[PDB]
Amino acid sequence: ANIIAPLLAPX
Secondary structure, rough: OOOOHOOOOOO
16 A cells, blocks of 8 residues: 555656
8 A cells, every 4th residue: 555655646
């Protein structure tokens, strides 16, 4: 679940 954070961070 920590990967999903930066996944849409710049989004």
